[PDB]
């Protein structure tokens, strides 16, 4: 039939501000038409690594719901957004399951997210008692206890503040420049699948 009602990929990719890696935004996308070839044929993306499905057949398959997780990380931390990886981002900020079906899209955003004085609006968790479970969000700002002594809310000896900031400056190296990451998570559940690609005539 005639196809309209496209999925809101403009409000995810072309968003004016992105969330931090710790309080990463999750947008549930349902009941629309998702054109993935517009994303795949763009030259603006440095990473388009798809795990569990290939980009060519994305435009044919149909999914129940699409989870669009958006955040900003460093250049050297893009590799940790993958199944089975380790690092500060996977252990304490954003963890992907091993059985993950979806795509990880990352692009350099030194133009927008870096200022000459230093942009300290973007934060990451550097400390937590245990590793995160897949698709878990921790936004707690409770003082990390590294020692036997109780912190009591004061950042003294052995008690650190968990969230640290990335001082994104334009003159940084490519491995320290800000990268906007959108992770699309595709699941098929027993409910009627409604996020389908465009159908040919």
């Amino acid at each position: 039939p005639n196809i309209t009602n496209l999925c809101p990929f403009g409000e995810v990719f072309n968003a004016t501000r992105f969330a931090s890696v710790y309080a990463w935004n999750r947008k549930r996308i349902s009941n629309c038409v998702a054109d993935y070839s517009v994303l795949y044929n763009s030259a603006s993306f440095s990473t388009f690594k798809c795990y569990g499905v290939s980009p060519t057949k994305l435009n044919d398959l149909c999914f129940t719901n699409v989870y669009a997780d958006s955040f900003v990380i460093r250049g050297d931390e893009v590799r940790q957004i993958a199944p089975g990886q380790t690092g500060t981002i996977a252990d304490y900020n954003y963890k992907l399951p091993d059985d993950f079906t979806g795509c990880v899209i990352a692009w350099n955003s030194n133009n927008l997210d870096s200022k000459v004085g230093g942009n300290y609006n973007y934060l990451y968790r550097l400390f937590r008692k245990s590793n995160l479970k897949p698709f878990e969000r921790d936004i707690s700002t409770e003082i990390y206890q590294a020692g036997s002594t109780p912190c009591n809310g004061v950042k003294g000896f052995n008690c650190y503040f968990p969230l640290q900031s990335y001082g994104f400056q334009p003159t940084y190296g490519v491995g320290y420049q800000p990268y906007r990451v959108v992770v699309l998570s595709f699941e098929l559940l027993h409910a009627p699948a409604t996020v389908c690609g465009p159908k040919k005539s």
Partner: protein, 596 residues
Amino acid sequence: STIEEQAKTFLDKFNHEAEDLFYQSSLASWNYNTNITEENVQNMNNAGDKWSAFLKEQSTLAQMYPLQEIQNLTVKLQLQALQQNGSSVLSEDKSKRLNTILNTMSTIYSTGKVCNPDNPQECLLLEPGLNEIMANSLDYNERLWAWESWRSEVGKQLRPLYEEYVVLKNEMARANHYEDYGDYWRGDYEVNGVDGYDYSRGQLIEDVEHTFEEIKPLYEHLHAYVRAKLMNAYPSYISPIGCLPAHLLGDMWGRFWTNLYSLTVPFGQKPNIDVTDAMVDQAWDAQRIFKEAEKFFVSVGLPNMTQGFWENSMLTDPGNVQKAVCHPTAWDLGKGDFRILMCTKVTMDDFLTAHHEMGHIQYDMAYAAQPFLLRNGANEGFHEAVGEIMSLSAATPKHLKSIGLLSPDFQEDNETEINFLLKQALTIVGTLPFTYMLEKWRWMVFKGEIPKDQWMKKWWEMKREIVGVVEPVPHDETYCDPASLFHVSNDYSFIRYYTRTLYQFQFQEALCQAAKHEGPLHKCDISNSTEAGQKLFNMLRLGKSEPWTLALENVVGAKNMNVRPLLNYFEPLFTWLKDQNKNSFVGWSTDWSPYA
């Protein structure tokens, strides 16, 4: 829970907070250096004060984690680096006095202006007013006047200041569980905790003497040849049996002998290897110079420069309106930001300097994966040595023919290699006895072997015994002749040049053996050899994570600094000097035979 995990979390917050504060301090220093303006000075001072205060607070907090309950070598190395008190162990009044003394010595050396009595209407500063006179004059009394007047003014100003300086630095060092300030400087080469690769502070002096004992025949022959040539230049002043007069060495202090190449050239009739005119004919920009250096580093297998390097470096003088420091400096600002500040001219010296500073940048880039407090050289010698090896390789006629800067039909005979080796000896071999004598004198001053009333009587005695250089007229204890040099007056270690010189040729032999060069060592070029670059990069990637002995094992296969690669480098010149010294007398007499 455990102490080690607590230290690891502490050194996980420290690395992140310090990288940010460092980057900010370094960027402020960069903005001052490329733009000398008063607000940039204020911003630099504010960033430096924040950085120093942060280092003081983290040093105060790092000591609360005891060292003996930590078994991981890297964590113990970072905690050992952080837990040094520095001047903080000293009282606030004495620390303020020491800081004031250091600042006033810096101002006295930097703003020291000396000119001739009875003609005081204009005066000349050290750079470039006195440097050009020392490097280019052929007049005995003019050089004598400049040398004696500058040591009179600078020494008479700095002698009480240095007497206070030695006592305060000894007090700080003994407060820091060191024998003296010399032991504090020698603690940079101290390796503790590694089985077999341990190195002691007391072993450094013994190794330096053992290497210098092998340096001594080559230096004696070079000294005899330079003495004969200077006797030709100045007929009556220089004695055949005595030491060289101090003010005739081509520099202000005797640090380098490279300004005597014109007087002491073996074969003047033969041409030089100057490629300046060839770059002028082909219109080589400074950008082309750095691209050729980058081509050399990608040829050996090292990574190429980042885009931010090309965007953010200043490789040309900005202009009259904007002032900048002209000294070439490689900056590792942090967070993958690497820059070179050089006012590059179209000369061979600037081209070799570009290779040297890009070698510094490659060394900085290699240990970027390491933690922040381990991002340095394994010792102070390696960081300069890895730039000097690039300076060695780039200067070879094979490299110049390979890049097209030299004519392909240039005849490489033995005479040009002899005079090139003599120039390299005047630059490299000549600095070794001066460096060793200066560091041994400073170590004896800090140790208390020499009383304050006998500092100069011993010093000239050392200079005659080691350097073979005699004073023009005797100096009493009102003079402070050592502190006229930049490094000693401004609290810098000086053994880094000696260690750099030995490590340079050790690295050169290791990479040339890796690259399968089949000729003389000075004719060796390490371009196009991936295996030599891999052998270099294995050590380069470690940084300060591993002991310098283990890094030296990684490159040359030896656990200690060695002198044989240097002697192998200068072996054609050594045979030529032995042939040329048949009539003349090798060695010197410590008596007052030339002049006193």
